[PDB]
Design a protein around this ligand. Structure first.
Ligand code: CLA
Ligand code: CLA
Ligand code: CLA
Ligand code: CLA
Ligand code: CLA
Ligand code: CLA
Ligand code: CLA
Ligand SMILES: CCCCCCCCCCCCCCCC(=O)OC[C@H](COP(=O)(O)OC[C@@H](O)CO)OC(=O)CCCCCCCCCCCCCCC
Ligand SMILES: CC1=C[C@H](O)CC(C)(C)[C@H]1/C=C/C(C)=C/C=C/C(C)=C/C=C/C=C(C)/C=C/C=C(C)/C=C/C1=C(C)C[C@H](O)CC1(C)C
Ligand SMILES: CC1=C[C@H](O)CC(C)(C)[C@H]1/C=C/C(C)=C/C=C/C(C)=C/C=C/C=C(C)/C=C/C=C(C)/C=C/C1=C(C)C[C@H](O)CC1(C)C
Ligand SMILES: CC1=C(/C=C/C(C)=C/C=C/C(C)=C/C=C/C=C(C)/C=C/C=C(C)/C=C/C2=C(C)CCCC2(C)C)C(C)(C)CCC1
Ligand code: SF4
Lengths: 39, 738, 212, 202, 45
């Protein structure tokens, strides 16, 4: 379990999780706030 | 003695080596010092020869790898069936195949991408698919979404079974080396059990499920009203109502009165006229014959009993005066080197895929397929590309064998040795014939361009000026059209409409008509011959000079993949066999792009179109325009890119976006292909200084890509760009004008 | 020696029997680290105590709802309490998160520093917010009747009973949720329907749990 | 060893380089498990037809064995105390307990006599041999007290079991092809042995 | 069916191959059935 979390700490896994989080955050913002051009 | 041989518990299932990147390589397990390491880690991840010298461990690794691949493919099939059941218009399409567009992908309503969900019919909105799954499902007799859902669950279960099989046969019970080396037994089991029992069980499914359901679907009865297949198996009186042969049961089979099975085992030929696909009764008889043939073929090699042939004896028996020892030693090569096997199997698997493309365009096997012009173009193009890639792979792994596994002290005056020993003659003759083909094939096009530009069309190579008729192909075509009368008495029609004859139309569209061959077809076929011969030249030269040449006498010691041997002796860039695969990749792209352009233009010009006479999609311009380069430039590329360039603001806009994106990626490849890593390393030096100035220099030292990785990135982005460009062009064109 | 959840297999090395309800059930090895197992022990106790409290609420409200006392069924109770009284929903939500975040943050930073909330910084209180074990905060407030400091073997018996009733109420609350998702009824209505026809009114007659 | 007649043409009891589920310990044990389930299957697929033939059970029962609700496309008897899925969940739980404790004694010999099972622990101490636990319940009477008598009884169990496995495969093939019960095939083959065979029913 | 043309051809093929262990019985019986099916379906044309 320590080695499984060490594998989850590797670079492509964390890049996948973090870009999934960032892309999902942007997607939810563009859903609830549709089409922001200003402000 | 052929038997099951297995070692118990070789490798412990543990997460330890997941946490140590590059564990498999003694060089890479030391850790990363520069950035090159990462790329190396991914490039050599599946190169099992560089991991161990032991053939057994390698064989086990490839076995479980294959299981992983099969589980992935089963996940993919599961996905296609699930998306076909839950997010599609398949039932609506079943009710009206001629006026509903097959769609099985829907997008979510965010950032405006909802526009891609277009009006495909059936009260549905989504992306029109061109994979052809709907026609495959209708041909199999599937009628409801529930059956597709059940197939999706089944395929997911099979994926889980394949991943368990991989883990099991690597970590728990991993086969021994002499198990893998039983090639006679492997051929027997795969020819009998796989191909034989495969086509037997499929013919079973066809005769018992496909034929009645599709006969009712061609009769016109509503799909929901058609009896479910288990009722077709259970009550044989219904099977006798459609085909009275089934009343007698399996009594004519065992008593050898097979002629009474002629209701559902036919030899009609042609196409189903109301449906535009091959007769499923012909396909059922075909799969029964194929089954019996392969089960006969699978009892050829000796295993645990005296009867049966021996592969080494058949190989060592064919020796002549011209070839010396002949096929001696080849058995030892093909039972100890995975790369030789991979080269053979890739070559034949690619060739087979290209044959699949041609035979599936010419003899449409699925109902309502020939008139789904987008599906036909997509299938042909796709399988042609797959084919070409597998052929280039064949040349690659042939060369890898030549460098790593070739050992002449068991391979001394042999077929392979003589090939290596007269390679200069082989390559020089191939060289000359490639130049000859290039000059005369391409020169006719340039000649025509010049004559047309100079206002002298009567001096061109065309059907009205200097004619170059494909007499041989026309004769073979005519012969195959006249075949049902004399040389195939029991055939009601020809095997394909393209030989000659009438015209089968479905829903106002042309399914297939006779394809005529003129000067333009002569010219494109010799272009095809030229490009294929050049590709063969590059790849074959790569494999024949992989070990040594007059330039690099000890090239074998430098490996399969290496950049060069320095700027000396005039310059030795791209001397490795890998670089020959790299150039063969570009030439394969060239060849197959001209092939799919030939297919696209010819089908849209002389075959496809509506029936009122027949009005073709481009009016029949092929015969007069396909003799000049300007004709291809204007009437094909420029004219047919109208649909892609004006696809904005509609559901096809994604094809415009991927048109531009693919052009971009293609151009982006030229930076890698035209440059070299010295410049980039020095640029990175300056940037590294800038990072050092602000205490943000990484501990893993930024390095420019290697020479061979620069070439690899180049060719990969080049292929992706070009192929995706033609993809977007083709799909937007054929979906809009189809 | 000790009874395992799966007879025949040995328990894992990180589950010794010191914990209450330690049956060696860790097939995914989620608690190999002692700190992660400590955190999961406290999460198990918090989920269990909320499930016992909520499940007794479900059972009492359903007993009061089948007999004609006017009690709602639990999937309608929040709506009829917010609409019967003049309670606004978001203010009661925010007050709940205020009080619960205070108490739960005290519990959080007592897990992080295992004696620190009894320094007198909260109003004047000392050793009444000092814990005793992980997830066992017995002082004068949380254990007012004082059963965790006399007859320690009986206190271990109560720890075992607490973990067992908590696991039972967690699967009971999952039962109420899935049971209502299938049947669309209150739970003791489903109990009366099972007592009416046991052989014919059960999960193999809905058309939901096994769709065959 | 019980039933060792040397009939192994495809060589699957080879101890050298064996593993997985192809081991003599798994194959002999699965052979007797299939044998015992097929003895019960043969007796159970015969018995309603012969008890309806002798006039002991009524005609509402005594149906063909594939019409019981095994295959509801082939027919299903309504008149059980519940739906067959209500029966089937009881079967899931019961066979899960039985088969799973049997698996645990195979993988860990003797492990079913320590953890509390309502006083049922001396019954499941097993032996140092799978497929033949014995004890106070699996061998109630002391039958096979002599070791040679025990070998003879194991050999008789092997032979009766292999015959019953062939019989159950025959019940399946016969039930698919002629669509009738096996005792009906007895009556039709004993009435007309020439005109009622496999050669007629094609 | 007993005594017909196809029956005599199949029996003659099986005896002709078996006249020319269990493995030899299976192999020559499969060859005799193949040869007999070939001759029966070839004498219909
Ligand atoms: C690099 C140049 C560039 C710039 C300046 C923009 C800018 C924008 N794009 Mg465009 N776009 C670009 C490239 C760019 N894009 C590319 C390359 C593509 C193809 C992939 C697109 C495809 C695209 C689509 C399909 C859409 C946009 C949209 C937008 C708008 C999004 C505003 C937002 O995200 O909410 C605000 C973001 C946040 C609140 C997140 C930040 C979080 C921090 C904490 C906030 C801190 C603030 C203090 C914004 C004007 C959306 C739009 O409607 O345009 C009008 C939209 O639907 N873009
Ligand atoms: C194998 C090929 C395949 C492809 C290309 C697609 C593609 C799609 N599916 Mg389909 N699907 C498939 C198979 C496939 N599916 C299978 C086998 C099933 C049955 C399980 C489904 C069941 C299904 C449903 C029910 C739905 C889709 C939907 C979709 C669409 C959006 C997907 C999405 O945004 O998810 C969400 C994105 C994520 C979950 C991203 C998270 C990725 C994580 C963080 C990666 C972490 C890395 C980790 C180490 C590796 C993953 C491990 C894994 C065990 C989680 C997209 C077209 C949706 C749709 O069509 O809408 C109309 C939709 O509702 N699919
Ligand atoms: C007649 C029995 C039989 C059948 C049907 C197969 C079939 C296959 N073998 Mg072969 N194999 C056999 C006997 C058989 N094998 C024997 C006797 C040997 C030793 C001489 C081998 C040694 C061998 C090697 C070294 C490899 C294969 C591989 C393959 C797969 C090729 C991929 C493909 O295109 O299939 C299309 C895919 C399908 C049809 C999917 C269905 C597959 C299911 C499991 C049915 C196949 C029956 C299977 C053999 C039974 C397994 C039972 C198991 C629980 C014990 C294919 C599934 C290759 C592979 O991919 O391994 C993973 C491979 O590398 N086989
Ligand atoms: C290869 C795949 C395949 C399969 C699976 C089938 C299957 C079938 N065919 Mg078909 N058929 C096929 C190919 C196939 N066929 C081909 C290629 C042709 C063209 C020559 C035909 C031409 C044909 C005709 C003309 C007819 C059939 C018929 C049948 C059905 C009855 C056959 C029969 O009596 O067999 C003999 C019986 C068996 C083999 C029994 C199977 C063994 C059982 C399952 C064993 C069970 C044992 C187990 C211990 C018991 C269960 C215990 C458990 C409950 C606990 C059966 C569904 C008949 C039919 O019904 O049509 C609708 C029929 O009239 N077939
Ligand atoms: C369109 C651009 C282009 C052209 C014209 C060529 C041409 C050629 N390539 Mg090249 N190739 C190209 C792109 C091109 N390639 C690219 C982009 C790459 C990188 C991937 C390569 C990589 C590559 C490889 C790996 C190989 C080739 C080879 C060849 C030669 C093939 C032999 C032949 O057919 O001779 C016939 C000549 C022609 C078809 C050229 C045009 C001739 C005109 C039409 C007629 C000539 C008469 C002329 C008008 C008279 C002029 C008089 C005037 C000077 C006064 C041919 C010269 C191969 C080779 O040399 O082996 C045989 C080979 O192996 N090329
Ligand atoms: C019903 C089973 C049950 C049992 C056996 C225990 C047992 C224990 N609790 Mg726990 N507890 C429970 C339910 C239970 N609790 C629930 C549902 C909650 C959430 C409210 C808690 C919240 C809690 C806290 C905050 C603390 C304890 C502590 C303790 C320990 C000492 C106190 C004591 O002995 O009370 C004995 C318990 C009973 C006699 C159960 C009475 C059941 C009532 C009468 C049911 C009827 C009322 C209901 C509303 C209906 C002992 C291990 C203390 C501790 O660990 O100190 C070191 C401690 O600080 N428990
Ligand atoms: C006894 C002598 C005999 C005769 C007169 C025939 C005659 C015929 N055979 Mg047959 N055949 C025979 C024995 C015979 N066969 C044997 C022993 C075998 C090996 C088992 C075959 C295997 C065979 C095959 C596979 C085929 C024929 C076919 C034919 C027919 C056309 C031959 C042709 O294309 O020219 C013709 C009626 C063909 C045919 O059209 O079947 C109707 C066909 O496909 N034959
Ligand atoms: C004609 C080829 C006859 C080939 C042929 O008949 O070979 C037959 C000849 C006789 O071989 P043996 O009888 O010794 O073979 C014994 C064993 O080695 C094979 O069973 O083999 C050679 O001598 C190879 C020499 C090839 C000489 C170069 C031929 C190159 C032809 C290239 C042009 C092809 C154009 C058409 C392609 C579709
Ligand atoms: C152990 C382990 C280990 C290994 O490693 C792995 C695995 C196996 C995964 C694991 C397992 C796990 C599990 C089983 C879990 C489960 C859980 C649960 C169920 C919970 C619940 C839990 C539950 C809970 C809390 C609940 C609670 C409840 C509540 C509050 C309620 C409330 C209410 C009421 C009164 C009434 C009103 O009117 C409304 C409401 C509001 C509704
Ligand atoms: C020897 C050898 C050797 C070499 O080495 C190889 C080889 C050749 C492979 C081998 C062989 C093998 C074999 C032959 C096998 C077979 C088997 C079988 C038949 C089984 C069955 C088996 C079978 C079985 C178990 C069965 C069972 C059954 C049962 C339970 C039934 C039940 C029932 C009843 C009562 C009645 C009701 O109605 C219901 C039911 C449910 C229906
Ligand atoms: C000598 C002797 C004896 C006798 C014996 C016997 C009588 C035997 C028999 C045997 C036999 C009588 C055998 C047979 C066999 C057969 C087989 C084994 C067959 C197989 C078949 C097949 C394999 C088929 C195939 C096919 C199909 C399926 C369809 C297509 C076509 C064909 C035809 C190819 C005794 C004991 C009395 C005494 C002592 C001495
Ligand atoms: S470095 Fe690049 S250029 Fe210089 S020789 Fe090696 S390959 Fe040719």
């Amino acid at each position: 379990m320590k080695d499984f979390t060490t594998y989850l700490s590797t670079a492509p896994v964390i890049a996948t999780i973090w870009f999934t989080f960032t892309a999902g955050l942007l997607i939810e913002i563009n859903r609830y706030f549709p089409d922001p051009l200003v402000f | 003695k052929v038997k099951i041989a297995v070692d118990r518990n070789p490798v412990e299932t543990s997460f330890e080596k997941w946490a140590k990147p590059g564990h498999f390589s003694r060089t890479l397990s030391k850790g990363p010092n520069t950035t090159t390491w990462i790329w190396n880690l991914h490039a050599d991840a599946h190169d099992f020869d560089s991991h161990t010298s032991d053939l057994e461990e390698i064989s086990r690794k490839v076995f479980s790898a294959h299981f992983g691949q099969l589980g992935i493919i089963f996940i993919w099939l599961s996905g296609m069936y699930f998306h076909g059941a839950r997010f599609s218009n398949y039932e609506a399409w079943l009710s009206d195949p001629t006026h509903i567009k097959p769609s099985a992908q829907v997008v979510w309503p965010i950032v405006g991408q909802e526009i891609l969900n277009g009006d495909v019919g059936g009260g549905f909105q989504g992306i029109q698919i061109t994979s052809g799954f709907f026609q495959l499902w209708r041909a199999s007799g599937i009628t409801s979404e529930l059956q597709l859902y059940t197939t999706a669950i089944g395929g997911l279960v099979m994926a889980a079974a394949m991943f368990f099989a991989g883990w099991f046969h690597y970590h728990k019970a991993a086969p021994k080396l002499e198990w893998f080396q039983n090639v006679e037994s492997m051929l027997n089991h795969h020819l009998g059990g796989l191909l034989g029992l495969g086509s037997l069980a499929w013919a079973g499914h066809q005769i018992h499920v496909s034929l009645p359901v599709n006969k009712l679907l061609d009769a016109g009865v509503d799909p929901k009203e058609i009896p479910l297949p288990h009722d077709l198996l259970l009550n044989r009186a219904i099977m006798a109502d459609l085909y009275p042969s089934f009343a007698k049961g399996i009594a004519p089979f065992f008593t050898l009165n097979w002629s009474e099975y002629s209701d559902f085992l036919t030899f009609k030929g042609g196409l189903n006229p109301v449906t535009g696909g091959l007769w499923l009764s012909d396909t059922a008889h075909h799969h029964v014959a194929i089954a019996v043939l392969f089960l006969v073929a699978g009892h050829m090699y000796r295993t645990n009993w005296g009867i049966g042939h021996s592969m080494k004896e058949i190989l060592e028996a064919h020796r002549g005066p011209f070839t010396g020892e002949g096929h001696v030693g080849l058995y030892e090569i093909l039972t100890t080197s995975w790369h030789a096997q991979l080269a053979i199997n890739l070559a034949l698997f690619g060739s087979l895929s290209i044959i699949v493309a041609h035979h599936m365009y010419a003899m449409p096997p699925y109902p309502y397929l020939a008139t789904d012009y987008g599906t036909q173009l997509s299938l042909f193009t796709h399988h042609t590309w797959i084919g070409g890639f597998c052929i280039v792979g064949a040349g690659a792994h042939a060369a890898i064998f030549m460098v790593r596994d070739y050992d002449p002290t068991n391979n001394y005056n042999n077929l392979l040795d003589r090939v290596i020993r007269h390679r200069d003659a082989i390559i020089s003759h191939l060289n000359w014939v490639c130049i000859f083909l290039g000059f005369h094939s391409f020169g006719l096009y340039i000649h025509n361009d010049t004559m047309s530009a100079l206002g002298r069309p009567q001096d061109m190579f065309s059907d009205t000026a200097i004619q170059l008729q494909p007499v041989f192909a026309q004769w073979i075509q005519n012969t195959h059209f006249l075949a049902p009368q004399l040389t195939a008495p029991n055939a009601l029609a020809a095997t394909s409409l393209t030989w000659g004859g009438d015209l089968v139309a479905v829903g106002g569209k042309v399914a297939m008509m006779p394809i005529s061959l003129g000067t333009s077809d002569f010219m494109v076929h010799h272009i095809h011959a030229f490009t294929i011969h050049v590709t063969v030249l590059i790849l074959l030269k790569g494999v024949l000079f992989a070990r040594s040449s007059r330039l690099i006498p000890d090239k074998a010691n430098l490996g399969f993949r290496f950049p060069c041997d320095g700027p000396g002796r005039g310059g030795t860039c791209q001397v490795s066999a890998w670089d020959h695969v790299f150039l063969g990749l570009f030439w394969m792209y060239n060849s197959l792009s001209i092939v799919i352009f030939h297919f696209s233009w010819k089908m849209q010009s002389d075959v496809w179109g509506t029936v009122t006479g027949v009005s073709h999609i481009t009016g029949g311009n092929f015969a007069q325009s396909a003799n000049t380069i300007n004709g291809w430039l204007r009437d094909f590329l420029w004219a047919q890119s109208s649909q892609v360039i004006q696809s904005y603001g509609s559901a096809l806009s994604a094809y415009g976006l991927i048109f531009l994106g693919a052009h971009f990626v293609w151009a982006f490849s030229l930076m890698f292909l035209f440059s070299g890593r010295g410049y980039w390393q020095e640029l990175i030096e300056s940037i590294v200084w800038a990072h050092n100035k602000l205490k943000v220099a990484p501990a893993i030292q930024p390095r420019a890509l290697s020479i061979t990785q620069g070439r690899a990135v180049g060719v990969a982005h080049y292929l992706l760009g070009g192929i995706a460009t033609t993809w977007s062009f083709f799909l937007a064109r054929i979906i809009s004008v189809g | 020696v000790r009874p395992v959840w799966f007879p025949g297999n040995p328990p894992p090395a990180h589950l010794d029997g010191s914990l209450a309800g330690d049956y060696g059930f860790d097939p995914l090895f989620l608690g190999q680290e002692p700190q992660t197992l400590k955190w999961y022990v406290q999460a198990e106790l918090v989920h269990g105590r909320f499930a016992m409290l909520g499940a007794a609420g479900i059972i009492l409200t359903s007993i009061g709802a089948k007999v004609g006392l006017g009690f709602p069924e639990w999937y309608d109770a929040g709506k009829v309490v917010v609409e019967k009284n003049n309670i606004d929903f978001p203010t009661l939500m925010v007050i709940q998160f205020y009080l619960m975040g205070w108490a739960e943050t005290k519990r959080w930073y007592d897990f992080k520093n295992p004696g620190s909330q009894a320094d007198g910084s909260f109003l004047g209180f000392t050793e009444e917010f000092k814990g005793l074990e992980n997830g066992y905060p017995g002082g004068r407030f949380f254990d007012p009747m004082g059963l965790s400091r006399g007859d320690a073997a009986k206190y271990q018996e109560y720890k075992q009973k607490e973990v067992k009733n908590g696991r039972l109420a967690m699967i009971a609350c999952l039962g109420f949720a899935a049971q209502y998702a299938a049947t669309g009824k209150g739970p003791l209505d489903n109990l009366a329907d099972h007592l009416a026809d046991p052989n014919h009114v059960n999960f193999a007659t809905n058309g939901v749990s096994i769709p065959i | 060893l019980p039933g060792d007649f040397g009939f192994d043409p495809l060589g699957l009891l080879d101890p050298v380089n064996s593993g997985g589920f192809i081991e003599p310990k798994w194959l002999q044990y699965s052979e007797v498990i299939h044998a015992r389930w097929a003895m019960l299957g043969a007796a159970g697929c015969i018995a309603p037809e012969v008890l309806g033939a002798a006039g002991l059970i009524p005609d509402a029962t005594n149906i063909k064995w594939f019409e019981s609700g095994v295959i509801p496309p082939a027919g299903s008897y309504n008149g059980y105390w519940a739906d067959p899925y209500t029966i089937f969940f009881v079967e899931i739980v019961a066979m899960q307990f039985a088969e799973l404790r049997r698996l645990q004694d195979f993988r860990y010999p003797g492990s079913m006599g320590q953890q509390y099972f309502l006083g049922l622990e001396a019954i499941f101490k097993g032996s140092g041999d799978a497929a033949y636990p014995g004890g106070p319940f699996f061998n109630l009477f002391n039958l096979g007290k002599t070791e040679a008598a025990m070998k003879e009884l194991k050999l008789k169990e092997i032979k009766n079991g292999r015959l019953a496995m062939l019989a159950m495969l025959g019940y399946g093939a016969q039930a698919v092809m002629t669509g009738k019960g096996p005792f009906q095939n007895l009556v039709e083959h004993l009435a007309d042995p020439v005109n009622n065979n496999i050669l007629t029913n094609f | 069916f007993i005594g017909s043309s196809t029956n005599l051809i199949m029996v003659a093929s099986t005896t002709a191959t078996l006249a020319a262990t269990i493995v030899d019985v299976l192999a020559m019986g499969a060859a005799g059935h193949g040869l007999g099916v070939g001759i029966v379906l070839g004498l219909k044309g």
